[PDB]
């Protein structure tokens, strides 16, 4: 999977075989690093009105 975000060390506990994490609206929010198995979050980088 691809996409833009701000990867940060999380505290979620995946299962040994799972790879993604999704929200109630089915959007990717956490990814397991396929080299070193540390689970990162994904926060869409800030936008907003002026």
């Amino acid at each position: 999977l691809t996409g833009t975000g701000v990867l940060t060390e999380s505290n979620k506990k995946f299962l040994p075989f799972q790879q993604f994490g999704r929200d109630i609206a089915d959007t990717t929010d956490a990814v397991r690093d396929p080299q070193t198995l540390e689970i990162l979050d994904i926060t869409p980088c800030s936008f907003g009105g002026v």
């Binding site: 691809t2 109630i24 609206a25 089915d26 959007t27």
Partner: protein
């Protein structure tokens, strides 16, 4: 289950947002629901067609969402005007519009806030337990008719009294509780009696 109205508003908006978001994951007749994926796989000539399809689809979904919101906001503005009227006529004063401020005679009300809405406490007055009195529209004393000023003529079968309409509190029929008019001839159902005089 009393707060169904507010809970319903919240649920309606949540479902609208969730449908809008989940429309992003549809193909609308294109290859893949992801843009970058087609941008890599296809060259500009065909990326143009795939994009144009995705744009048409997402734009239609967005317009549908905005129209739903417009209609629901018109309805909420109707209910807000109603709440403003009810607070101005029912708190800041005492009203005489039946059932506009809760079942019964209206005494006052108190407002209370609540998340996205207001909650009134209509203090009302309800008559409780009655008695079967015998009545008569007027009384004859000296050939002239006597009508009650503000009240009604009741009788427990033995005597006669004049009492206010909403709370049995009998009083002797003086020449002050009543006012005279005409004679015994014309009214229907009058009854002879003696109006005392102070």
């Amino acid at each position: 289950s009393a707060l169904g109205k507010l809970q319903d508003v919240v649920n309606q908006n949540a479902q609208a947002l969730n449908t809008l978001v989940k429309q992003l994951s549809s193909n609308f007749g294109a290859i893949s629901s992801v843009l970058n994926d087609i941008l890599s796989r296809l060259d500009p000539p065909e990326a143009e067609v795939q994009i144009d399809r995705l744009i048409t689809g997402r734009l239609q979904s967005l317009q549908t969402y905005v129209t739903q919101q417009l209609i629901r906001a018109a309805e909420i503005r109707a209910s807000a005007n109603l709440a403003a009227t009810k607070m101005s006529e029912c708190v800041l004063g005492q009203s005489k519009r039946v059932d506009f401020c809760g079942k019964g005679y209206h005494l006052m009300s108190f407002p209370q806030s609540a998340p996205h809405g207001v909650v009134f406490l209509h203090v009302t007055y309800v008559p409780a337990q009655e008695k079967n009195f015998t009545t008569a529209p007027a009384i004859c004393h000296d050939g002239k008719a006597h009508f009650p000023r503000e009240g009604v003529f009741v009788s427990n079968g033995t005597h006669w009294f004049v009492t206010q309409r909403n709370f049995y509190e009998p009083q002797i029929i003086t020449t002050d509780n009543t006012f005279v008019s005409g004679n015994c001839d014309v009214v229907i159902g009058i009854v002879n009696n003696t109006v005392y005089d102070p």
